[model samples]
Structure formats: C-alpha cells, structure tokens
Target chain A: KNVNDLITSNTTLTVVDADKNNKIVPAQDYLALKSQIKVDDKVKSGDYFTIKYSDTVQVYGLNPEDIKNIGDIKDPNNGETIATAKHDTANNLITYTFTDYVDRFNSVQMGINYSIYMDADTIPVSKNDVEFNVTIGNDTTKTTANIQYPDYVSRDNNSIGSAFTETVSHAGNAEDPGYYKQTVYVNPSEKSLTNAKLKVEAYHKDYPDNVGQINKDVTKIKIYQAPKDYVLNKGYDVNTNQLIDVTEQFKDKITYGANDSVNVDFGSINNSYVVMVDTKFEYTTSESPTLVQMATLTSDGNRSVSTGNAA
Target chain B: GSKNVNDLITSNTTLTVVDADKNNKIVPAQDYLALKSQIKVDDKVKSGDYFTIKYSDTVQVYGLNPEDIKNIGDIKDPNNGETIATAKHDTANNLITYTFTDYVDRFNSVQMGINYSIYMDADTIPVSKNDVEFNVTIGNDTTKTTANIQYPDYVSRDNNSIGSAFTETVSHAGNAEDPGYYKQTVYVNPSEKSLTNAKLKVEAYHKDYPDNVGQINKDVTKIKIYQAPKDYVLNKGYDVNTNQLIDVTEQFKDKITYGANDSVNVDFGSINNSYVVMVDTKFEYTTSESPTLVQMATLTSDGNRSVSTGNAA
Candidate 1:
C-alpha cells in the first residue's frame, strides 16, 4: 500500500459579543443565566418577543410592597418570553404574547454570548519524533449589554386576561444556551506507526475569584476504529521478530467524528478538557526500519496536531 | 663588724646547716599549754586576747678548747651574732605562729627580678635596643662586656602613634574669597602716585566625572558669552531694556568625553566672559543708562575671575 501519515486541526463557529467587554467569569454565574435567542427569533424579520415577571431580588432586605415588572431583554444580555393565543373553552378568548422575567437569586445578572468561527488548520511541529501533538486552547471571553438597564423589551407577557389565557411555549431562552462547531483531518503516511493522538485543553483567564479556572467539566463524543483495521502496531520483538503487546496498539481509528463533524459540550464553565488523539512514535529507520523502505509521509499528509470546541 | 660577719659566714660555709626552725626559736609548745591552762578543754581561741612567749639566748664562750673549759675572762655577750635567739613558745588555742626574714639579701647582693632597673652609670651599663640578657654574671672583672641579645617576638612593641600621618604647615587660614595673603602693591605709575586699591574675587568650581563605566565617550559641555561695557544699548522710544551688558550665551557644542574618574576643566573662562562684559559695562558707561545701569557699568572695570587650566585636572 501507500504511506498514510498526515494531521490537520480546524476550529469553526466561535461565539462573541460585540457590545461586551470579553473577560472570564465563573461558570456558575453563566449557568445562572442559562439563556439563548432561538432560531425563529434570529431568522425572523422585524418579529420579536419579551419576558416579564415581578420576582424580587432580595439580598438582605425586602422593601417596597410594589413589585417592578420586567422591561426588555436583548442579545447576549436580557430577554423576554412570548406566547400565541387561540380560542379555548377554559378561557373564552386567546391571545398571542411573550413573557419577560426577573429572578431573585439571578439578581447579579450576566450577559453571555457564544463566538463561532472556523479555526486555522494547525500542523504541530514534531518534537523528538516526526509527529505532532494536538491541544485545545482557551481564553477568557465575555459579553455585555449594548447600553444599560431598562431601555426596551424583546418579549413580554404583561397583560392579564379577563377571560381564559392559553399558555404557549418555545425552547432555549434564559434557560438554554448555544454551542460552536469543530472539525478535524489526518493523514498517517507522513506519520510513524506510533506517536499520534488527539487532545484538548482549555484556559480561563481573569475570572472573578478564579471560578472559571476551577470549572473543569466537559462533554465528549468518540468515533471508533474499524474492528478489522489495526492501524496501531507497537513493535516487533527483536529476538523473535514477532509482535509485542503495546498499550498504543491502534488509537483514534482512520478518522474522528461520525461524519465530518462532532458536537461536544464544554459542560460547566471552569474550562473543559476533551482529548481526541495524540502522537506516540514516528517512522524512523530506528523505530520502524521498514518505514523509509516502504513510503514517506509529507506535510500535505502529515499525521500530527489536534483541535477542540469547533473545527 | 664586717670582718666579724665575714668570719662567721666563713665558718658556716662548711656547716651543714638546715633551714631555721621557727617553732623552736620563736614560740614553743609551753606557751600554748599555758594558754590552755587558762581556758576550758573545748574552748576556742577568743578575740582580742593573745598568747605570749618569753625566752633568752645565753651564748657559751667560743675559742676555748673542750679541755680548757675552766679558763677565766672568756665570758662572751649572750646576744652576739653567733647566739641563736631564744623565744618563749606561745599560742592561742594551740595555734603555733612563725615569722622569719632569713631569706632577705641583707648584704646588697644585687637583687633582680624583684626590682625594675632604672638608668645607671659606672657599675651598670643600661640594656637597650637589641641588647638584653637572660643570665648576667657579676664579679671583679676589669672589662665588663654586656651581652647583646634579641628579645623574643612576643616581647616586641610597635612604637608608632595613632591618627593622621600628615601635618599642616599652617593653621586657620581665611576662606578662598578673601584668602589670607601677604599685602603689597606693585604700582602702575612711578612714585607710587598712580597706585590704587582694588578688590579681587576667586573661586573653585569642581566638575567630577563618574568613576565607572560609560565614561570618556561622553562629556558634559557648557558655554558662556558676554557683551562689553561700551556696547551698552540705551533705551528711549522703543522698549529697549537699557544700556546693560548681557550674555546671550550658547550651549556647549563640542564633544568632550569624560572617562571614569576623569577630572577635567570645562573652560569656565568662557563663563567669565559674561562676567567680564558686565564689569566692563559698569566701569565704562554711565549717563547712557539709569542709576542701576550706571552702577553696573562701574562694576565692569574688573576682569572676571578664572582658574588656570594647567591645574584644572
């Protein structure tokens, strides 16, 4: 056969907030405001909604019997809830509306936005061996309100129905969030029989109380190698010239992702760690004497480097 | 008396005499027993009271042969030097006391180690410098050669005094401005008629360079300028400042490198130029300027002070 050794890592779909000062913050703080603008809201034209409620934000004291209602919720910041009305036996008349909300514990509100983009393919330089190592990098990113509090509302349910009011609902508001997409590629010809792996790591800088740095939860999905294909062969016993048991047998199949892409959740905020694959050894005359005798794996087909988040 | 002492010493030279027994001559046990008789058997010696002794030495006639003991006019003084002084043994509470001075050099036999030697002439040649001796022999010799000896290192002493090494030739001179000096006048005119009294000023301005790195290649430069007295420009119509000598001095433009520890002359002569102009103006111009300007003109007569470059460094 031909030599198969090459590696490529890509990042795409990064989330960002143009109006916000991007800085790292506690994952718990972001989780408290688990909110998102839906596809319908984003894809629509001139159509909008809002959320409204009188939830008191009590830190120590409870004052002013009169409760204030929610005003406006915008991109990467505040928001509102909406509902459509229909006729029903329980409420005589039905109405279309969106609801705005305010929570007591969520008093210290946070504006979070996701940055999505395609990362430049990286081919890590080989160290001692002719293979590259892959890693997932992170940065303290932040988002903010365009202006400040109480300018307008996007979704609102302020009116009370004299007749029956039918409840309506949609998904992913201040309760659900969005994620970025990532992809990867590899060529084993340029790489040795060993020294190949995919790894991911993150960093959260300038976080309050260093909370983001402490958040290490992440979600991962794995693509397996074919049962018959043993791409990873450790070595042959020098004395017997037979195969030896190596923990590195065959790792990270011919490719990763069920198809061309895999979606992973970087669970909680602290920064996540989802290692895909990494290099172990290369095709040097000393390592695999049969390497040069067979074929050569070039840069175009180099087997090294890794990617995470979105590729 | 000296001859008798010598005779006695000569006779004792061959005598195998042991050290004197103070107990037998001074105080004997009989005196102690007498004190014990006055007190109880267990009583200690009480304060303020003492046991006393009484005895007498009765000397026997010498020179008489053992067979001529019966001879007459041979009686001798019982207290002569030959007599062993007798004493009454005394003690308080069995305490026997002894007092003897027989070891003294009574004949002036040259006592040493016990006395510090002062300078002496004749019989004594002083030991000084490198000459000293451990053991010196004294006798009747015609020539006495003092042995030259070196003291051990441990016995040596450094004779230098403490404090500054240099001494000033003069003390309490006036400061640099009115430095103390001899007064004299070398006149400009004959017969001392044109001679005049004048005040002069002098000063020392020091410029020191760094002692370490980054020197020489870089020197600090300054410049000075001046206008003469006759050039006093008076003011009337225009807002001319006045008939005043001014120094529109420029900055030093030359490259003068200062080496480490470099002491150099910055040529204050140029600086004095400014002063010179002021002095000349003060001395030459008057009516063309105000009273203050005239006063300054008078001051221009004197030349500015400057130091000799030869001694700058």
Candidate 2:
C-alpha cells in the first residue's frame, strides 16, 4: 500500500492480533506489549522513508490526527515499511507510533472526511496583483498554510526567493462567511500568459505547527501586467542627434492611463537607441509617469549616417 | 352721236334742229333742240409764273369772285363751302380730249337736293422746273439712274478729290528678319475730300542711296502693315498676277469701330524709293461687281511673285 494511500487527513488506524486472525486487539493488550517508537511530523505525504515489520510483531496502531511530526514514510506495498518497523505498544488501540511502520494486514483505517473552498474571484485576474479567500469550515483565523507556484513563475524580489508570506485574512467565523483573504503579486513575462496553479500547503510558514502539512490544489490563478505611464512621442535624427519634436509639431498633448500607448514617428532615429524619456516633457495629467523600454528597432538604414564618400 | 360744233382757231359756235309735221309743211310751233357754247380768250403762263382763276368759258363774266367754273380743273365739295380750281396755266395748256364706251342697260334718272346757301374757291396751275438728271455711260448696258452732276470746277474738284500717296522705302539694313532703318514719303492731296482709292508699288534694295536703284532690285520677301496701338497686319499671300483692294472705311469713317487718323505701316522685304502708294478719288466715278481696272504691280526677280497683299483698315 502506498504511504499516501495509507495516510490521509480523514482517518485513524486500528491494530489486531496476527495469530488470532482478524481479531481486534484490546487496549489493555496494547499497554502490556510496550514498544518504543519515533515520529517525524515533517514527513510530507508524497515523501519517502524506510521501516521494517515481521509476523512476531503482532499489532500496530496510529492516529491520523497525530500523524504530524512523522518522518518520511515508505510504501507498505513495497515491503519497505514492513522492513523498517521499530515500535510496539501494550495498548492495542495505540499500538504503534505514527512515525513507525507495522504489518499492513494487521491494521485498520479510520478518519473524518473534510474539504476547503477558496474564493479566487475576490480579487480579479486582470489586476497585476490579486487576493483570494480560503474557507475551511468554521475556523478562518488560522495561519496554517503557505502558497507555492510553478518554476516558470518568478518572485518580486530582486533575486527570486522561495516561500509566500501573504496569508489569507479572516472574516466572520463559521456562523458567517468564514474565510481568510490572501494576496499574491505575479511577475510579468514577455510571452503570452495563462492561468497558473498555486499550491497551498496547510503547514505554517514557520513549519512549527502540530497540524500535518495538508497540500491543497489551487487552479486557474489569474495574472496580469502593470500599466505604463509615458510612451515615446517622436523620432530623432541620427546624423545630428536631433530630436524630431513631432509632438510639438502637431501640438498633440496626451493624457495616459493604464496600459495605454501613443503613436510616435521614429524615422531616421538610430536603431540601437535607448529608452530615454525626456523628464522635462510635460503630460496632460498631474500624476507621475512610468516609462518602459520597448524592443529595439532592427530594420536597415536606421543605424548610422554617412562618414565620407564611399570608395 | 356728237360732232365738233366749232373750229379751234375760229370763234364760238351754236347748233340747232327743228321737227316738221307729217307733211312737208313746217309745224305751227317749232319744237327745236338747240345748245350754245364759246371758247374764252387765250391766256398763257411761263415757267415759274403764278396766276388767279376764271369762272366760265364765256368772256370771263362775273369773275365769280372765285365761283364754281363748271370746268375740269375745279375741285368742289359744296358741303364744305369750297370750290378750288385755279393755276397759272402751263405752256402746254387748253388741250382737249375725250373717251367713249357704251353704257349697257341705262335709263336717265336725275335727282337733286337744293341747298340755299353756298360757297366757292379757285387756284391757278403753276409753271414747274425739272430737276432730274440722267447718267448714261457709253459701253455699259446696265442703265444706271442717278442725280444730275453737280459740277465742281476743275481746280476746286481736283483739290478736293486728290488723295495723299505714301511711298515708304527701306534698305537692307541687317538680316531678312530685322531690317535696319526705314523711311516713308507721304504726298498729301491739296484738297480735303475723303480718299476713295489707293495703290502701292513695293520694291526691295540690298543697299543704300548711291546703290539704291539697281544694287538689290530683288522681289519682296515679306511686308507688314502696322497701326498705332500695336496692330500689325502681315503680308497676305499674293497671286503671281492678282492685285488686292485695301478698303479704308474703318480708318476714314467717323462712325467706325477702329480709330481714324491712326498711323499706317508698310514694309518691303528690303526697301527703296521704287515702292509707291498712290491714293486717289477715281473709285467714286467707277462702279462694278467686277473690278474694271485693278492697280498694276510688277514684281522684281527675288520678289515673292506668288504673293498678294490685301487689307481692310
């Protein structure tokens, strides 16, 4: 049996007498058969570890809720969990530590079913920045989760760093609209973009919580780019380094909003010209302008002026 | 039914007829048809004479103080109290004549209304002078009717009828296109009547005075007539043998479109005194749809014999 198959947030485990065949071991028998065990709550669901088991080691038990602090788990079907067993207990109902392995045929499973609903639309996708609400039953104040993105996505940090800190803020309790609001800033890309899946881990950012790390799938995340301020307004003469001053020629003052652009006549301008906006230029609006460098021009006859008569 | 009762040269005469009874004897009463008449004393009037009137054929009785004459000349309408028939008789007067024709289906019917008051009048026939003249030319069959000639004496007529002639001659000063200098000779007619005719004889010379006459007596290559206000009429091509008329009505008449007394220009390919312009009034005496005598022009060797010049000034 797979470790992910054997372990789930919904169920606990039961131990049994192997010789007795399908007979549930009493709690008193569990205490009498004392055994020592170690548990690693850090063991994630998809992670792997080793363990041993034998027929003489009759019973084992574990609680799904207490499975936190467990080590990496090995798959029981591969016999790795059986070979790595290291604990036993006298209380049949609690025969083994969650961190140990036991006979797969000698344990029974138990737990409660649960789910979460995230309101992704609380913050729309067209916005470069977005916020969403996560709902899990009546409890909304817990900061027991962290978010992750695919490798293709980037961080706002100068040198991209891992981990997300913007937790979902909580609103009304279980009786009301219990939800925690989360905000995430997305990195822009030159290539056309699509929705991304943001993984949500129930583990706390500090990774110090007793609650097991529950990974939740968050799909169809919205992403967008920020608006620009000033766009190029005219061309320049490369030979004399003169600004074309088309804007002044036509008397076309402009007001720019988000994601807006203005046409420019850039003929005779050097092909390798830099994005140098004249700060002295005034705009129709009072707000500060954001400048962006566009792709360089690559056409011929736009790079230089004559040096002398050609031979 | 009638006969002359008296001879013209004799005295006044009478006539009578009597009717006898069935036997040859005369009737106790003579019922005769008889009438009396007379010719008045002869009276005459010369040309330009005026006279009064007589009332009857008998020796001027009553004079009538201008009463109805019972004669052919009287024009009367008694309703208006007038009877006028008088004149100093013409030299060929007192002549008699008559007409006769049958009056078919006629019977005598006489009616008369008598008016108590009456009036009369008279006039004399005057002698008249003939002012008509006839123009009869010998070799012409077409009879042209015109007024008699108002003869102007020779000196006076010639003075008025003669025309001013222009003889402009220029020498080959430069090239064919640009001839250097030009000179004109104008002869004014002594008298002042409008000119009716003009003829020009043009010649070209290659050099000036001493060499003028024979140096370059070539045919004229071109000629132009110029006027004030920049009007230049170029040479109209000539027929090797044809002459042209220059009607100057617009230039001479008062009520014409172009101004009168404007300067005139005449150019010869190159010129000399041989070129002549003769103006006269002879055209006034001649009339024909076909020109009888067009002025003659003889061309020199180099002259464009194929050209003719014409103008309507």
Candidate 3:
C-alpha cells in the first residue's frame, strides 16, 4: 500500500596521500595522487554495494598497459575473490555484491578497502569539489571531497583594472519588458589583455531571493559589448542602437560546466571592455530581484578580479 | 529549438477517485484522488541535460513535502536503482527541477517510464467542471504540456454539494445465477430542507447491451431501488427478473422501494435520505459479456424542480 524508499549510506571519500588530509594546506594540486572510497566492507549475503560519481568523474585511464584491474583491486579479505567487482561507465557507478562477509562481509581480522587510481592528464579541469554517492544495501549516502588544482592563469591586479557596476531599474521598453538591465564596465586597462577569461554569473543558487521570495521565476540573460569608456544612464533604454549584442560570442566561448552559467573569453582587448546583462521574466510579483556577480578576469597576475552589484 | 521535455512526459495526468463514505457520498480530503504523472525520456535528451517541471494550481500540493522525491526511475518497473536527474522540490511553487545526469560514459539518457504519483484532496475538483486540466510548463521554455484529469460523475466533480442528487458505488458480488451484481447507493437531497418529485432510475446492461437490460428467460435481469441499511448487501429470496430485485412490502424485504419497467420511481408521498439501487444481470455463463449498472436521478427541492444528475457512463 505504500512506496518503500531506500536509505542513505555513511561512506567516506579520501585521498591516498597519508600526511595532507582533514585540514586545508597550502594551495596544492590534489589530482596528482590517487583517491579511495572507504566503505563498510564486511557485509552479509545478498547485500548490495555501490559507489557512484557525478558526471564529471572518470575512474579509468586510456593507457592499455594497466590491463583489466579497474581502480587497482586490493584487500579482498584474506583470499576472498574480488574479480566480480565491476564499474559501469554509463551510470558512473561501481558495484560489488557481498556473498558472505559479515559485519556483513566475513572479515575475521580487519575491514577491506578499494583504491582508485587517478591521473591529472585525463580528469577534466573543474571545481575542487566532487561528490560520490556510496550505497550499502538500501542506504545511499553522499560523500564529498575537495581536491584543489593549479589555476589556469595567474591573476594580475593591473590586467583588466576594476569593473564598475551600475543598475537600471524598471526600464520601460515597449518591445522588451525587462524588470531591470545592468551595465558593467572595465573603464580601460593600461595592459593589453590576452586570452584572459572574463566571467559574470548571477544565478539563483548565488542570490537567493531572485523572484522576490519564491526564487523560482525564470531568468532570461543577455550580454552585450559597447565602445570604449561607454556608460549608460540608469533607466536608459537597453534596446538603444548603441548596445551591441555580444551574447552569441560569449555563449560560444563558454568553456565550463552545466547550462546555467554565462561567460566568455576576452581574446585580446587593448581598450575598455563594457558588458551589459539584461534580466527579465514572463510573470512575477517580485518588486525586487537581485543580481550580484563576481566579474572575475583570470590572467597572469594575482589581482585580476572585480565585483558587480545590481538589484 | 532543442529537445523539449514535453515529449518526455505523458499526454494526460490521471486522477482516479477513491474512498467514498457511507451513503456513497465523497468527503473532501478524506476521499483523496490518486494522481499520477508519468515521464519517459528519449535518447535525444543527453546525460546532464535538465529541465524544470512547474504544475498548475489544479491540485493540492500542501500535503506534498520535499521528501516525496524518491529515486528517479519507475520503482515498480525495471527496478534499477538509478536517478537520471538531480531531483529537488519546493512545495510552495509545486516545482521539481531534474538536471539529467550523464555518468561520464555509462548511461547518457534515462530509461522509459520514469514516473511519480501523489494522492491529493478531492476539494481541488471544480464544483462545475467535469474535468480538471493541469498544465506543466516544461523547463523555463514557454512550450507548455498539459495533463487532463477527468471524472465520470458530474455530482462527484460538483464537490457533492448538499441538496443535490448523487450516486455512489456500494458493493459488488457474483452468484451462480448472476455473475455481475453492481449495487449503488443513491442520495435524494439528503438535507433537512427537502421536498420533492423524484425518479431514481437504475438500469442493468450486459456485454452487448447499453441503456436497456437484456430480459431473457434464463437470464436473471433486475433493477430496483430500495430503502437501504448500514453496509447492506443483496441476498435474494423475494423475486428475480422482476422490475425490482426485492418486494419491499414483504416481512424481511427492503421496503418502500419503487420500480417502473426499467427505472426507479421516487415521486411518492415519502422521501428518504438514501436508497440502494441493485442491478442483477447475467450474460451467457460461458461468454465474455458481463453486467454493469448506470443510474440517473431527477427530483424537486425547495428552490426548484426537475433537478437531474448522471453521466454518460
């Protein structure tokens, strides 16, 4: 008469390195070492075990020399065969059924563990955080690991200069009824920016009360580029002939994850870089929908970042 | 221009009625309706491709909490423990966003019949409309999809208003003579302010029959509306194949009943809160056809006369 739901497990994810763990150390590339999924290895018959990863994970390598050992099988509990362990790539899931180890796997001496080998060359460059869902029987628990990586380009404070932010509230356009459209400017930098990544993200997960209180109102974002030292008055017409639609250029240069972000590559800019973001929805009662983005310019020095605010 | 989620979900969301009370009257909240919205994705929607589902205010989301989001696949089918999307809910908005998962290299898409269900209060049904259509605006795209929840009875959709006529399913059983006997309880203005000229008509039909009963010599076909008792069932003795199933005036018969050629007459000196309409009919003992019943009622109350209720069923 009722749907029986499964429970979450309490599995743990950790790095193979012995010394640097549980505390944040100096910026280090953790991807250089192997990672492991520690579970309650001792289990009873018919108990199912699985360790799954998010879409960003790749457990094996392209080198054929490694052979059939996926994730370097180790410690099968004193002569117990572990050849049945298999990793499913389509689901990013790994499974092993326990026939007779009781705690539930029949380990008389100690517990069992599996070590997953890692290679920085193969893993995609992404955020330092990754999640793994570890399932023991009906219980599936979420385990997380924060492994830092070397930055793409060092930040330079003088590269892109500072980004100036301005908001135009309730700008009435008969054609585009956007609640508000924002204008962000990089005044003009002394240095010639080369291959510097410029990104401005205003998502619901960042600014919570977007649709006033519901926060679920749909967001339609558009980005634009104008002439050097360009500045539009607050509540100025966004559809003015002056603003150039650079949305397509940035969308094509989105070298990142998921579909919710808006960014681009600043191939080479000798003068000022002014960008505009137009935010609007179909239907909502929100008197205030906020938009605050960290406009980051990733380049060769340490101070290549600026903040933008709008409400 | 990309793939939309409207093609992934079913064409209609079904809401089946359940849990009728004594006198066959449906009580709101107590008699909840079963709601099922099924989704089936195709190969076009790759792994990690996601969309949000926004439901119209046609049903109640008050009872639903964030915990209703179980595993993503159909729990009753294939039974594979996999979730194609990142599922989360906000009951305040009746919204669930599923960002499809693409396990590195394993499954780039979800399987067919990725479904979910919820039981909702019957009060959400309109007092006038026969069907409630729930709109699902797929993702953030204006390309909308809809699910129609239909009801077979006008009175049921009418929220079982007082002073109106309605019929409820009472019981069902089979005997050696008749394999299909569907009994229903009909209410005639079950209110204190009642005065009327009423006719509660009950008809029994077989497999090939509709509206009229197949009155054969060997077949025991009958339609009768009698004074009902608490949780009653018909165990015959008085008559068979007659206008009424039982002789009400008899010592133990269900009395004060009325029966015409194939309908029940209610325009008499006395009016009752409830009456049981019994249909006893049988097709060939070895054939495929079975017996079923449909009732129609017409009566007069204080404000008006010739008030009627029934469905095409």
Candidate 4:
C-alpha cells in the first residue's frame, strides 16, 4: 500500500569519528544513514524506499569483491541489510524495494531500515555537515549528517541526533484532547548548558476552540518549575521519575496566551529536565486537536559537539 | 441518450490507460497495471448502505483524497458544506469503503461520483493483449471497464549530460571492515564525449597528513583511466584497457596545490564518453586517504556542447 509516515523521530545519520575527545566528526570520515519506516500491516511489498544523496555526498553502489556481506553498520548489534540497492547517478538516487517476510502470515506496526555509505571527502571542502534526503512511498524527509556537532536527541553510547535543536511532541490519549500530554526535548547537551532559553507554542485550530479563542489560555506551552533535586543529572529523557501532573508538581510555570510565546530560561543545565506538555483543557477532535511545537532553543553554553570539531 | 440527475445508477466507471513502464525491473507497470478509473454513484446508494470497493486479488487501495468523492449538481450536505459518503481507506487489503451518511439521505435524489485515479498491480492484467478489461468490486456489485496503453519516451537533446557521480571508498580508515590495502574507483555518468570536454577536479585527502605528510605523495602519486564497452557502464569485473599509473606528486605540479587542512587538488585533464578515473592510494598499518574525486561538466563553446550540467554525472 502507498503509505504516509516516515518515522521522523527515529531517522538518523552517523559520523565515523564522534567520540568524547572529539565531539564533532572529523573532516574526512565516512557517514552512514539508517532511515526508519513505519511498517504496519498496510506497508506492502510494492512500496519502496527512495534515497537521494546530495551532490556533495557520493553513494557507493555494487562493486566487485563483496563477500559474505556484513553491512557497513556498527551499532551495538550490527544492523542487518533488508534490501539491495539500485543507483541512478544522474539523480543521486538509489532505491531499495521494501519487502516483508510475513507472506507466510501477516505483519506489524514496526520499523525496518537499510543503510548506505558515502566518503566524507565527497563533502564539499567547506561544509561541516550535510542533510541526506530520503523518501518512503509518497512521504519524504531528511536526516542531517553532521561532522562537527554532537547529537542531542538522545542516542545510545553517543550517536548523532536531530537538527531541531529542541523538539516538542504530544502523546497520551488522543481520545481527550484537553488532557493530552506534551513532551519536549530541550537542547540536549553533554556539559551543563548555560543561559539557555526556550520558546514553544501550544496548538489550536484555525478558527477557534470551545472558549472561542484561536489559541485559548487553556491551551498553553508549559515549562517545568520543579525543585532543583528533581532536575539534577537529567537531560531530555525525563520520565516516570519526573512530574506526572504539572498543576501539582510544577509550583509555577511559564505559560502562554493566544499563539503566545513564553520565555523560559535555564542556566547551568546538564540534562533533559522537563518532558511533558498538557492542555489546561485545550481543544478537541469534534473540530481538531491541539498540538505543541518547540518554536526555538538557544544557549550560550556547550552543546554536545560532534566527534570532530572544536568550538 | 442524455443523462438525468434522477437516473438510478448504483455505480458507473471508465478505466483509462495513460502511461506505463515496460521494464519488468522497474515500478508502476512493472509491479502493477497502470490505469485510472472513475466510479459514479447516485440515488440507489441508500443511507446506512456500506459499499466495499476492492479488487478480488487485493491490489491495495490507498491515497483517497476527498476531491475524488465529489458532489454533483444539488447533491450535497446543506450543513457541513460537504456532500454525503465518508470514506474508509482500507490499506491492509487493497480496499475502500463508503457508508452513506444520514444527513444527505433525505434528499430527493443524488448525483455524485468517485473520480479516482487508481494504479493497480497483482499477477493480473493480460500480458498479450492491448485492450485489457478491469474490475473493481463495490459491495456486492462490480464495475467493469477497459483501457489501452502507450509507454512514454526518453528524449535526448543538446550537450551530453553527466547526471551525477559517486566514489566507491572500499576501505574504511583503520576501522571495521578495514583492509590494509586501499582501492577506490570514481564513477560518473557523463559519457566519453563530455569526458574530455569538461575540466576534472581531482581531490586527495591525507589522513593524519602533517604527521605523516612525507608519505602523502608516495602513497597516492598515481592514477589510471579506463573506458567500458561503448554505451555500457563499468561495474564489478568489467574493466576496459588501463592507462599508465601516472604519479601526480611531480606531474600535476608547478601548481598541484596542497592545503594545510591536508588535502590536495590537481587538474587531471579530461577524456570522452563513458570513461572512469581511478587512484592507487591504499592503506598501510595506519591508513591514509586516497583522493576524493568528482567530475565537473564544463561546456564547450562549440555548436555541439560537452556537458549541459542538465545531463551530468
């Protein structure tokens, strides 16, 4: 079936040399991308994965001497290749047919991925990082491979993360829009990020919600105002150990007004301390559901650098 | 005969064959029959009636945009600014469903159609015949239609185009899957004609250069050129005649500029049609990089162009 979702939160590109000593990836190391696809029972065989590298990235295709074929992946469990590749040099395009083994039965709402390699030298002489674009069925997205910055979106044993710097999302039950929970990953940093500022917005409908406001006071971007002990050592992975209800645990919060922006500042923060966003009774699905977004995040402090560069 | 809004039609359809990809290895027609159909519904569609649209072999029905289900003259929901049926795009098994809503059920008669462009594939469709019949099952009833197809064309004009290019770095630097010896083959699409026509920029990156800068030229130093059989591409095991492994340390000099960042670039002249540039920079115990390669499509001012950039590798 022609599908619509390309697991945005899970797609990523890895640098060859991002380590503690060198956070940014070195100038000339290979980069690999593993883009995840949401394969539900609906994801059929005819659907394919479209990968297009930039002019600056050179994708290696079938060559002689390939043996038992262990893929060029190095995660905890080296990834297995699920598809073969076909390259069209003209378009910088390579496609892999997405297949399912469940023909003996049915399938699941899971993820499957394949990777391709590129020489860092293919990167232009001046660029520190570059975005790799991919398409799954009709949907398309990008995963940036940074040679000079650390990934803050949370990776195991330090893998490259997302570019949004900060990301805001909402989960919990969509059944009740007003009580839906929102989560945000503020700029993820290895060191204590100093004087950092964040701005997020709560979603509302195009027209208006129950109280007749396009963005009502009920719908707001909330910040964590918990005790210092609660935030100690956390960085974007706050969960059950953290606050459940903002109205109770959060003594005070940075709130917003109609499409309003709120200023929430944190100094000397080492981890993701705040994780959930909620509606003080926002909107609903009779019309549409309220959502949230990380408008922007900035810091004058150290971000997890990639495996290669300096400040 | 003229049609009437009150005509009691359950479903009407017409399938049109627009285009197809004949290559059995590619998409659209390769995996499925390339055809589009329009399904019309009228007063016979009763409220609470559930219509299931599917193909017998399960040809996955998705991508149902609302405009495909449009309201015809005076048949619309006076309240929601919308007309009747709501759709359920069943992806699990190529199926679609529509259940008539109560709001538009009280209308005198209806005029609406499912104007969908569907591309379906299975181990079906007549391979030997041009006029092929199609079937789409809607609930208990079925709509029948047929179409003829014409494959599209690939036209070439003006200068030679080098679509895109990539360098296959077989050896990783002192990492997993690292072989002590390094080998690299540069792949580009601009063929023989444009090969010599465009100015080629060859760049070599030195790993840990300054520390071992002395060995840079000795390790890298030379290149070879090969051309595949005319109109064919070079791949594994496919090697045409090779040229001298020319050392660049002294040859491409006078101005084979080197940088402190540990990379060197030289203008390695040019060639024509379907040719490839290769290097011999390999890995020792401590591996160093061979040069990175890219082909630039520099157009010739002559009436016949070398590369149009539009058609580049």
The best candidate in terms of lDDT: 3
Higher-scoring candidate on DockQ, 3 or 4: 4
Clashes of each: 101, 47, 22, 43
Model 1: per-residue lDDT, tens digit, A1-311? 00001111132222233335452111101111123322221212223222211111111111111111112333334333332222221111112232233222222222222211111111011112111111111111122211111111111211000100011111223232221111122222222222233322222122212100101122233222211111211110011111122223332322223212222221111111112322111112221111000011112123323322200
> Clash number for model 3?
22
* Per-residue alpha-carbon lDDT of candidate 1 for residues B168-188, written as tens digits (9 for 90 to 100): 011112233322111111100
Per-residue CA lDDT of model 4 for B1-313, tens digit only, reads 1222223345545444434444433222323333233335565556666556666442433211222222211233445566576666655575665666664457655545554555544234312335445667654556665444322221123544433222223334455454333333443333345433233333332212223212124344345544445555333221222432222334444434332222333343354445454544543333545423222222331234333221111
**lDDT (10s digit) by residue, model 2, range A1-311:** 22432332322122323334432222111211111222233433233322221111222222222222222334445534422222222211111233233432234232222121122111111122211221111111111111122232232211111122111211222232111111122222221222221222222233232111121121111112222211111111011111122334323322222221222222232111112121111121212222121111112322211110000
DockQ of each: 0.00, 0.00, 0.00, 0.01
**Which model, 1 or 4, shows the larger lDDT?**
4
What is the per-residue lDDT of model 3 for residues A1-311, given as tens digits with 9 covering 90 to 100? 01012222334545434345553211221222123333343334444455554332335432222223454234554655432356665455666554444343432222324434333321222324444443443445454555443222223543332221222333234354343444444423435666656665554466664421111243333555544433332212232333466667666665443423456576765554545544453233343445444456665433566554434
Give interface RMSD, per candidate: 41.2, 48.4, 37.2, 21.6
Q: What would the TM-scores of all predictions be?
A: 0.13, 0.11, 0.22, 0.23
Higher-ranked by lDDT: 1 or 2: 2
Q: Where does candidate 3 stray beyond 4 Å? A: A1-83, A89-92, A97-111, A116-133, A138-311, B1-313
TM-score of 3: 0.22
Please name the candidate that would achieve the greatest TM-score relative to the true structure. Answer: 4
Chain B of candidate 4 versus the native chain B: what TM-score? 0.34
Displacement of the residue A154 alpha carbon in candidate 2, Å: 31
CAPRI quality level assigned to candidate 3 from its DockQ score:
incorrect
lDDT of 1 at B166: 8
In model 1, the Cα lDDT at residue A83 comes to 25
